[PDB]
Amino acid sequence: GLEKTVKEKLSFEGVGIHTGEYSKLIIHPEKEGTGIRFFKNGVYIPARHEFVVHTNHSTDLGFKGQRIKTVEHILSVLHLLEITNVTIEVIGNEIPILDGSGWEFYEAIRKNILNQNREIDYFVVEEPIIVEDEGRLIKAEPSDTLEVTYEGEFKNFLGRQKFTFVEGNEEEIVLARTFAFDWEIEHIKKVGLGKGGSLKNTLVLGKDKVYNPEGLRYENEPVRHKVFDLIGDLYLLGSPVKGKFYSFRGGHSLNVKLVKELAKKQ
Numbered sequence: 001g002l003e004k005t006v007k008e009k010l011s012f013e014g015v016g017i018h019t020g021e022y023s024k025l026i027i028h029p030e031k032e033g034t035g036i037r038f039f040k041n042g043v044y045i046p047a048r049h050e051f052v053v054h055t056n057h058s059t060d061l062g063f064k065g066q067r068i069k070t071v072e073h074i075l076s077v078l079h080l081l082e083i084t085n086v087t088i089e090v091i092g093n094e095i096p097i098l099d100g101s102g103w104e105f106y107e108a109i110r111k112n113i114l115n116q117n118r119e120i121d122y123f124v125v126e127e128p129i130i131v132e133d134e135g136r137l138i139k140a141e142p143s144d145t146l147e148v149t150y151e152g153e154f155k156n157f158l159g160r161q162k163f164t165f166v167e168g169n170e171e172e173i174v175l176a177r178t179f180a181f182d183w184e185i186e187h188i189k190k191v192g193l194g195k196g197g198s199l200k201n202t203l204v205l206g207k208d209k210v211y212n213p214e215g216l217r218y219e220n221e222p223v224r225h226k227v228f229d230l231i232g233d234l235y236l237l238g239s240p241v242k243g244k245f246y247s248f249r250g251g252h253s254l255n256v257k258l259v260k261e262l263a264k265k266q
């Protein structure tokens with residue numbers, strides 16, 4: 001694969017799911033070897049694990065006093081389309097959640113790619129590796145292509161489900177929205193988050209009900225979204241990844257922990 005960028009600057013705006021504030025993104029084209037980096041109030045924040053500052057309910061990056069919340073969905077979409085060089089100008093403190101998935105991001109960026117002059121320097125999983133955390137576990141091993149599998153165990157009716165993404169099946173996970181359980185909400189609201197969450201950007205699930213009148217987009221939309229989240233967090237490795245990943249009840253914190261590990265020994 002060749003490094004890629006966008007043909008022209010792309011704009012996305014809307015409310016951030018956690019800040020409740022309105023924000024805007026401007027994806028600017030960059031040259032080969034530039035990498036992926038965010039831009040806010042004069043500072044450039046590399047989409048790398050060294051800059052992660054929060055992993056509860058979202059993955060946030062920060063540097064020199066500037067923080068950007070929820071970079072995972074845009075990062076995931078970017079990772080899936082192999083865009084390797086762009087500056088993401090952020091006007092606000094959080095990426096717009098939009099519809100909760102990566103559809104609007106995917107559609108736009110997809111029909112605006114620009115192949116550049118350089119073979120992508122993929123991050124390859126050389127040796128196996130596993131990170132655990134009281135019940136949770138993420139196993140990563142060598143693979144020619146990107147293969148991500150998430151297996152969740154829900155207290156609710158979804159029971160236990162697992163979904164697998166393989167290169168070429170991008171459209172199967174880009175439409176999977178952000179989801180939360182009614183019982184989580186009071187907590188998320190208490191800790192200062194979810195200020196911008198509604199049934200328009202979040203899929204709310206009860207012990208046996210789906211609050212959204214629209215319903216689920218797939219019988220397993222939640223695990224598909226967890227795969228989507230993990231693919232976004234993986235991009236924090238600095239470059240497109242190739243490897244077989246299996247996450248069991250994984251999340252951002254653990255996702256980020258796996259990356260830091262993969263970074264160390266490889």
Ligand SMILES: CCCCCCCCCCCCCC(=O)O[C@@H]1[C@@H](CC(=O)NO)CO[C@H](CO)[C@H]1O
Nearest residue numbers: 057058072178179180194197198202204211229251
């Ligand atoms: C009450 C009746 C329904 C209408 C009211 C809806 C209220 C919505 C409140 C805000 C919801 C925020 C969703 C959210 O933070 O999901 C989190 C998820 C985020 C994510 O997708 N990251 O990529 C990451 O994993 C954690 C769990 O570890 C999830 O909690």
Ligand SMILES: [Cl-]
Nearest residue numbers: 056057187191
């Ligand atoms: Cl929490």
Ligand SMILES: [Zn+2]
Nearest residue numbers: 001002119120
């Ligand atoms: Zn190539």
Ligand SMILES: [Zn+2]
Nearest residue numbers: 056057188191
């Ligand atoms: Zn919390």
Ligand SMILES: [Zn+2]
Nearest residue numbers: 072178225229
């Ligand atoms: Zn998400």
